[model samples]
Target: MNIFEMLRIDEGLRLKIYKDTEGYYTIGIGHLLTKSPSLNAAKSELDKAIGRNTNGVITKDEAEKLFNQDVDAAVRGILRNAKLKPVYDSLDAVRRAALINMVFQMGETGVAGFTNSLRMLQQKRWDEAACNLAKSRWYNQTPNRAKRVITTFRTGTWDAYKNL
Candidate 1:
């Protein structure tokens, strides 16, 4: 068996929609659908795959195949996505990586909604950009990750220990 098979067996196959030991609404080799839109999409995909509303079922092999396809498209989508074009050449790697990760996690539409932060970036005021991020709901939702990105934006380095 290959790595995917190894991971598949390690993860275990569950054909039913059940709340796991954790709070996550999980299925098919521990796939977690945690939030809306992402959750919505996953539900639609999994439902369709499993024929949950119909008379069919989705096997572990089937779900894993779909999961692999999604991972591929997600990466390719992020790479060519227009959202990152604004920062492509305007900022350093630290800033770019922050934006890239933001775009990846939140989707382009979500990250593009950071108007004040983007304005600060356009102004080349890295300090204010960092401050703007702290003021965002994104910060409230994911404080530590937000702090790391804000610090990188301010210090122009990924080294969390560096001066900012």
Candidate 2:
């Protein structure tokens, strides 16, 4: 599930998630949200970033003019990011999904900054991994999101967030 499915952004809620126009999933307060992009400039940047969250390159101009209006394209970005599932898969599905969700919320740059956390996970230090997950700027900036995802990563069952 994507971060939006994990966090659960509901209808009429109108959160700033990077919702894919075609995707059934979305993210909460996606990157590049908060103060939306101008339709004119938004189209330009969105066109290049097309289906990416933090890093998208314009390989081909599929729908440049409709960039800003293409939330589905942005949703592709989340999927593109999630494609790195193998990286998380080796750890634990919960951790894999949580880290993917965290990377979805944060960026690879931020996740990369978790040098110790990555090491902890690599070494199978699950407890240390959870603690390390919480000790990030992500935790400080997005507490609810961080706590919820971290809880899942630690406990292995998303019972708390199953209803969300």
Candidate 3:
């Protein structure tokens, strides 16, 4: 599956503002409004997408727009990371999408913190990378999603998409 479809399933659509697992004010496919680089800019974007000042609500189309923007930003951040760039480039499309998905959830810094895992990924040590990922607090916090992502990394196929 495409990254957008995969992330849509993982993040889920939210038309109204809600607290995420970490209690951040989030909306529109896990967009963390509170943590945005510029809250006003994010709000204005949402407003423009929905064609009005949103009061905690957005249309499905607006949510899709925000999702696309967030995904693009995540991809850009992943590609721009010096340490991740080579590893990202070495992978096939499915595995590359897996990396993007991880970066999408955790941000480049968060994913970068997995030094051992990244090393394994760079070496094409799929099993080792998946094992390292399972050891993270991120895995504990979101076991099912983590498992799917790890499986994607390990298998280098769309097998994870079937279960989800």
Candidate 4:
């Protein structure tokens, strides 16, 4: 499956403001407005998306727009990292999307901390990469998502996320 579709399932959709697992003020598809660099711009976008002044609400179309923007940023962030660029380039599309998905949940910096995992991925040692990923606290925190991502890395296919 595509990254957007996979993210739509994993992140889920919310038309109204809500606190995420970390209690951050989030909206749309996991858009953390609380940490947004330009709060005013985000608010304005939200207003425009809803066709009026808004009070913590968004429409599906606007939410999709935000989702796309977030996904693009995540991908760019992963690609921008010197350590990850070659590893990402070495991966197939499915594994690449899996990497992007991890970056989407935890920023590139966080994913980069998995040095062994990255090395394994670069070596195309799928099992070792998956094992390294499972050793992270990130896996403990979000086991389901981590499991899917690890499986994708292991199999080099979309099978793990196919239902999404």
Candidate 5:
């Protein structure tokens, strides 16, 4: 499976959806179609989960009510299903899993849509690719997350305490 398949979205859908709850008031997972307020909702969700307010708006609470562990798992599904699978064929199981967690933090589209990072990864530019991953708009959106995954990639041991 790929990130899109895991998230039940396509690249197009990933780019255009929101993650809001039903009734136009609650917060639920949402995408481009079969839903409303997709873009705003997704950004809102991403921003809140990442601990920012870029749109300066959030439909949910002051902090993520969702379990952090579940967020990690859900994002791992997204990465494995769509994002990384489309490009890399050489990742080891550990690298794959660590990268999945990175995508989980960064979001499916973030990994898929990276231009410089993707190019570097394609060429096996591990160091450059790691640096590129640290330089994303999303990375700037959350520095700690970018560092965390880069550390995982380099050290093969990922967790909050690792501070990758």
Candidate 6:
């Protein structure tokens, strides 16, 4: 491809305003706009597109644009930041996703603090691992999310697991 064509392809096509990972305002093919009038304009457009949730919003098209880049990074984040690699890897994809969900919601240190659960996970103690997960205040954080993870840790089954 020619330079112009490559640049077009490399940047991808973006017609709407959106937020970057750092929550900065962006528009028109990854063009990050941070100035006030421009930001206000983006904010206005976003309000028109989605709603004023946090000063800005993105269209479904923009969301798809961003998600293409972000979802994998989120998944990789779990693989990278997980303290118990053996235990983390031992899980099936669904359970692994749940663990990664925790890592995202609660940082690596946070997950590490679940020493009881990690210990059981490391020892291949499936039932204990599930019970370990259940016997925590974090379990009360969300009934469906916790139940799914707990169930997977217990039975290796993905039933009742909340899909992100």
The best candidate in terms of TM-score: 3
lDDT string, candidate 1, 109-155, tens digits: 67766767787886789887888889877788767667766776787
- Model 6 clash pairs are none
- Relative to the unseen true structure, what is the Cα RMSD of model 5? 11.0
Q: What TM-score do all the candidates reach, one by one?
A: 0.54, 0.56, 0.89, 0.87, 0.45, 0.56
What alpha-carbon RMSD in Å does predicted model 2 have with respect to the real structure? Answer: 9.1
List, residue by residue over 44-158, the lDDT tens digit for candidate 3. 6566656788966888887888889889998899888888888888999999889889998888988877889989999999998899989999999999999999999999988
The C-alpha local distance difference test score for the whole of candidate 1 amounts to 0.59
Q: Per-residue error at 83 for model 4, in Å?
A: 1.2
Give the Cα error of residue 128 in candidate 3, in Å: 1.1
lDDT per residue as tens, model 4, 46-79: 6764577877787888889889988999989988
TM-score of 1: 0.54
Give the least accurate 10-residue stretch of model 1, judged by summed lDDT.
1-10
Expressed as tens digits, the lDDT of each residue in 1-164 for candidate 5 is: 33222222211122222343232322222211223445665566556654765453433333233323444565455546554664445565445555565554445765677767766665667787778777666567656645655654554443433311
Better of 1 and 5 by TM-score: 1
Off by over 4 Å in 3: 35-51
Q: Judge candidate 3 at residue 143 and give its lDDT.
A: 94
Candidate 1 vs candidate 5: the lDDT winner is: 1
Candidate 6: regions farther than 4 A off: 1-54, 65-70, 162-164
Task: Give the per-residue lDDT of model 2 (tens digit) for 57-152.
Answer: 232233222322333433344345434333454666566656656555555555656767777776777777888888767688667767777777
Candidate 4: misplaced stretches above 4 Å?
Answer: 35-52
What lDDT would each prediction earn against the true structure? 0.59, 0.51, 0.84, 0.83, 0.48, 0.57
**What's the best-to-worst order under lDDT?**
3, 4, 1, 6, 2, 5
Top model by lDDT, which number?
Answer: 3
Q: What is the lDDT of residue 33 in candidate 4?
A: 70
lDDT of 6 by residue, 69-124 (tens): 43344456656654656667776665665565555434466786787788787777
